[PDB]
Design a protein around this ligand. Structure first.
Ligand code: CLA
Ligand code: CLA
Ligand code: CLA
Ligand code: CLA
Ligand SMILES: CCCCCCCCCCCCCCCCCC(=O)OC[C@H](CO[C@@H]1O[C@H](CO)[C@H](O)[C@H](O)[C@H]1O)OC(=O)CCCCCCCCCCCCCCCCC
Ligand SMILES: CC1=C(/C=C/C(C)=C/C=C/C(C)=C/C=C/C=C(C)/C=C/C=C(C)/C=C/C2=C(C)CCCC2(C)C)C(C)(C)CCC1
Ligand SMILES: [Ca+2]
Lengths: 120, 50
């Protein structure tokens, strides 16, 4: 574990935790025991912006873009119940947390494309 | 003295100022190139090569 000071300024604070190469197991679900997600976390790696095919509809694709703001992208502290369903499936239901971050990326042209990257 | 259309003959044999002159010209032609570029970059649209 590292204290605040052990992270401050490294940018490490905007990174969801990681599991080692080992941890490739399996977790059990009691289906008779409620479960919740104590901490969901999402870290962006890429932001692609589908381009408008001009008038000539020719099918448009997504293109990479430069992150003009900085390392403020990550969503963290997400939480909610992970109810088990009758058919034995699982559906997560978020309640609260840093569930959104305003991001801004530039493009080929120089156009800044702001988005409210979220999962509310 | 000199007619207007002859003022540059003042260099016919002053290798020094002839080079000084030729240097200034190159400067303007190079200068033009640089800035004609910027003008196109400030107005050219890459949005569609087709
Ligand atoms: C390629 C290089 C070149 C060079 C180094 C010269 C050099 C010279 N020429 Mg000459 N000339 C050239 C091409 C060239 N010429 C061509 C292609 C033509 C046919 C149009 C002529 C026709 C010509 C005539 C009829 C005469 C000269 C004369 C002279 C001498 C003039 C002295 C002076 O004070 O200029 C004076 C120049 C001015 C006062 C200003 C001219 C302003 C107007 C017409 C143009 C402005 C142009 C613009 C700013 C940029 C032009 C860019 C260009 C690429 C088109 C000088 C040594 C004179 C001479 O022999 O004197 C003893 C003379 O009577 N030239
Ligand atoms: C492109 C290169 C060029 C070069 C190297 C020269 C070089 C020279 N010129 Mg020319 N000249 C040019 C272009 C050029 N001229 C043009 C286009 C014109 C208009 C016709 C003239 C008209 C001219 C005259 C009438 C005389 C000379 C003279 C002389 C000599 C002057 C010595 C001196 O004390 O400077 C002083 C003289 C100058 C610096 C030339 C004037 C330059 C002015 C016209 C323009 C400056 C450009 C401006 C700030 C930017 C443009 C912006 C745009 C939006 C309009 C020198 C060897 C003199 C001479 O024969 O001496 C023995 C002289 O009497 N020149
Ligand atoms: C022995 C080698 C030699 C070399 C390599 C050159 C080379 C050159 N001469 Mg030349 N010259 C020589 C001998 C030589 N000369 C002799 C014995 C005479 C009789 C006196 C002349 C008389 C002469 C005249 C009258 C003129 C030239 C010009 C030019 C230039 C034309 C192209 C240009 O300006 O583009 C531009 C490309 C560049 C600026 C990049 C060059 C980068 C390096 C090579 C040089 C950086 C500058 C350096 C400190 C000084 C250069 C000295 C030069 C002799 C190499 C060119 C750099 C013309 C000129 O000066 O036009 C403006 C011109 O009018 N020369
Ligand atoms: C590739 C070849 C090339 C050649 C051979 C020349 C040759 C010449 N240039 Mg240059 N030039 C070139 C490329 C070239 N240029 C490029 C790429 C640029 C950047 C755009 C310039 C920019 C430039 C400037 C800014 C000036 C020259 C000038 C000159 C002349 C200097 C010597 C002189 O006194 O002539 C005697 C001058 C003449 C014989 C003029 C006749 C020009 C003919 C060819 C066309 C006339 C058409 C029309 C009246 C011009 C419209 C002008 C507009 C303002 C309304 C010479 C004839 C100088 C000049 O013209 O001084 C008077 C000058 O000031 N040039
Ligand atoms: C590492 C990556 C570094 C990347 C840098 C990217 C810079 C991009 C600029 C951009 O996209 O601008 C795009 C802009 C804006 O262009 C303008 O946009 C406006 C709307 O925002 C309007 O549409 C205007 O009409 C339009 O002209 O830039 C230009 O047009 C620039 C011309 C630039 C010439 C620059 C010369 C620089 C010279 C330096 C030294 C010279 C000697
Ligand atoms: C000094 C210096 C510097 C800077 C520089 C600069 C900034 C420059 C600029 C330059 C420029 C900015 C230039 C420009 C030029 C231009 C030109 C050269 C033009 C020309 C024109 C013409 C010639 C025209 C004509 C015509 C007309 C009008 C019409 C009809 C046709 C014709 C075409 C004839 C530096 C920092 C590097 C360092 C060292 C020092
Ligand atoms: Ca666009």
């Amino acid at each position: 574990t590292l204290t605040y000071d052990d992270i401050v300024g490294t940018g490490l604070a905007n990174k969801c935790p990681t599991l080692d190469d080992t941890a490739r197991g399996a977790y059990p679900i009691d289906s008779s025991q409620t479960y919740r997600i104590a901490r969901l976390c999402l870290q962006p790696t890429t932001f692609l912006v589908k381009e408008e095919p001009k008038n000539k509809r020719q099918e448009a694709e997504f293109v990479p873009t430069k992150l003009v703001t900085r390392e403020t992208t990550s969503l963290d502290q997400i939480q909610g119940e992970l109810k088990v369903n009758s058919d034995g499936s699982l559906t997560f239901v978020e309640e609260d947390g840093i569930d959104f971050q305003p991001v801004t990326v530039q493009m080929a042209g120089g156009e800044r494309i702001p988005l409210l990257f979220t999962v509310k | 003295g000199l007619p207007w259309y002859r003022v540059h003959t003042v260099l016919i044999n002053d290798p020094g100022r002839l080079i000084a002159a030729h240097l200034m010209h190159t400067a303007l032609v190079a200068g033009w190139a640089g800035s004609m570029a910027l003008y196109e970059l400030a107005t050219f649209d890459p949005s569609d090569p087709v």
